[PDB]
Amino acid sequence: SLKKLDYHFHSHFSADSEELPRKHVTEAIAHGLEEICFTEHRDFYFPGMDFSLNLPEYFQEINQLQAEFKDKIKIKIGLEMGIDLRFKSEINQFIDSAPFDFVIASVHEIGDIEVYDGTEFYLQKTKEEAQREYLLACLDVVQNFENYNSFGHLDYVARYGPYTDKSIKFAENREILFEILRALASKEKALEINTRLFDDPKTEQFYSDLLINFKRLGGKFITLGTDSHIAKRDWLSIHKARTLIKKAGFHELATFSGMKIDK
Numbered sequence: 001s002l003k004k005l006d007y008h009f010h011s012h013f014s015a016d017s018e019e020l021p022r023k024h025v026t027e028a029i030a031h032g033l034e035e036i037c038f039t040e041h042r043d044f045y046f047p048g049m050d051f052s053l054n055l056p057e058y059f060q061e062i063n064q065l066q067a068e069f070k071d072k073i074k075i076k077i078g079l080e081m082g083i084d085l086r087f088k089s090e091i092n093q094f095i096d097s098a099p100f101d102f103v104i105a106s107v108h109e110i111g112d113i114e115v116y117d118g119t120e121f122y123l124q125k126t127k128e129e130a131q132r133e134y135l136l137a138c139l140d141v142v143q144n145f146e147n148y149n150s151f152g153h154l155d156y157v158a159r160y161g162p163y164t165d166k167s168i169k170f171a172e173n174r175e176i177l178f179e180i181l182r183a184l185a186s187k188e189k190a191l192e193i194n195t196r197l198f199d200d201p202k203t204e205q206f207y208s209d210l211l212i213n214f215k216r217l218g219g220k221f222i223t224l225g226t227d228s229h230i231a232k233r234d235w236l237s238i239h240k241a242r243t244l245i246k247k248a249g250f251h252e253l254a255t256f257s258g259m260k261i262d263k
């Protein structure tokens, strides 16, 4: 069976969450999770809003929780790193500055335009064009950046936009997704299954296709996370994602210590 875990979530150390770190831990324990990894935001030069991370306070707090809850759950100290290749040196210096257990590489902005509801990003742009641009940026990251463990939310672009149906389809993006998935597999990176939109069957379909094609292209490593910014989680969405990962033929989820996969 897949280990019960959450490898993508945010607490008050992230600029867009107010959650108490301890509440994530107690919720995790209450739902039988064996392991969790905090993955707070750092995004360099993010447009319109600071996404900085106080490393001394973050590490001190999670280290305290690790000790407090040692007998009950395994806690890892990770990072969701927004990638922009213009800032590669700053990004690598940041990752290498503290003993992170796990790093997610994510695309949150492209060309100083945030990928979010209401921004320039979706304005006078078809959904298909927004998807094309988003995935091109993801490929750019996978081809040119190495200092991470798992690739975050490939469906991020489907969270937003003026469209009534914001869903992303694998087939409409096949060529670029094959390139991304083949490169992740070749470089021994994990694919994140992100449950944020899993209450929508169209999200399940997209990730089903991602999983099947990743495996066909040599993919081995899968991480699972909620992107929850509060402790209270949608547990049905987590169950759906786990069921899907199993159906696709993956028998384990990847966990990391000091940015090295646990074996």
Ligand SMILES: [Zn+2]
Pocket: 010, 014, 016, 041, 229
């Ligand atoms: Zn956030």
Ligand SMILES: [Zn+2]
Pocket: 080, 106, 108, 152, 153
């Ligand atoms: Zn993200």
Ligand SMILES: [Zn+2]
Pocket: 008, 009, 010, 080, 227
């Ligand atoms: Zn996140």
